[PDB]
């Protein structure tokens, strides 16, 4: 019932190999819907979901202009961060930013987000109050002072409480047939003998949307968290996701094991056993 809009910016320097690359992608929930790549011959914000294609030229012109400006601003920012950490011109570095808004089933703002990382380490984040910053170190304190002087937090609050939520609700309505449709997993349990002594039970969940899912193995009703191998939820490429959970069981004890599946698309949570 709740939804999110997020943008993910990646800026990466590559000294000796041109100017830093700037990439930006937008998501609603687990659905990508736009992209921008400064390495393109003619960089533009481009559609990646059918329900955004109906936006007019003024939309695509705005998003392209913002991203082209961001390409330059993030290049300047990467130069600034190199200075803050006394880093040589010779190394490559990464600046990442993720921001956006969460809304409830009624469309009201639950929380806004703006977080940044430098070389994979948290750097600065807008606090949940949308009014103050948390800086990770003395370099990020310099960014904080710049952003306080530019009244950045006030602008984030305005965006996050306003246009972010308004456009997210617009997207949720234009893409309702997919964005507001939870597809349940198709499930099954496989059995892979290892030895005469034990075998693997693997519980599969396929074709589900959104990616949030719980797969657990119980033995005599007790969760086997420590003994369960979970793979990372992975995309099928058709918008849906896949996941499995595996446990190693003593031969002949298989019926003491139950796989439990929780997912928004299911009428009721599932309990599964190996069916030989």
């Amino acid at each position: 019932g709740s939804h999110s809009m997020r943008y993910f910016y990646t800026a990466m320097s590559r000294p000796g190999r041109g100017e830093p690359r700037f990439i930006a992608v937008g998501y609603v929930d687990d659905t990508q819907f736009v992209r921008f790549d400064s390495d393109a011959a003619s960089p533009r914000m481009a559609p990646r979901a059918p329900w955004i294609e109906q936006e007019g030229p003024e939309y695509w012109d705005r998003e392209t202009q913002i991203s082209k400006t961001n390409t330059q601003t993030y290049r300047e920012s990467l130069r600034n961060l190199r200075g803050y950490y006394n880093q040589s011109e010779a190394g490559s570095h990464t600046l990442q930013r993720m921001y956006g808004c969460d809304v409830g089933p009624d469309g009201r703002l639950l929380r806004g987000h703006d977080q940044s990382a430098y070389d994979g380490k948290d750097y600065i984040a807008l606090n949940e109050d949308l009014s103050s910053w948390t800086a990770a170190d003395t370099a990020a304190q310099i960014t904080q002072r710049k952003w306080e002087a530019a009244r950045e937090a006030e602008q984030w609050r305005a965006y996050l409480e306003g246009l972010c939520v308004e456009w997210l609700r617009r997207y949720l309505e234009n893409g309702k047939e997919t964005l507001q449709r939870a597809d349940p997993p198709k499930t099954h349990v496989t059995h892979h003998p290892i030895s005469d002594h034990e075998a693997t039970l693997r519980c599969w969940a396929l074709g589900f949307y959104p990616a949030e899912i719980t797969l657990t193995w119980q033995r005599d009703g007790e969760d086997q968290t420590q003994d369960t191998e979970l793979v990372e939820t992975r995309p099928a490429g058709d918008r849906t996701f896949q996941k499995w959970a595996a446990v190693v069981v003593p031969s002949g004890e298989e019926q003491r094991y139950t796989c439990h599946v929780q997912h928004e698309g299911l009428p009721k949570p599932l309990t599964l056993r190996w069916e030989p």
Partner: peptide, 9 residues
């Protein structure tokens, strides 16, 4: 809808 382009770091 992107946030407007803001201040450098």
């Amino acid at each position: 809808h992107l946030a407007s382009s803001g201040h450098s770091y």
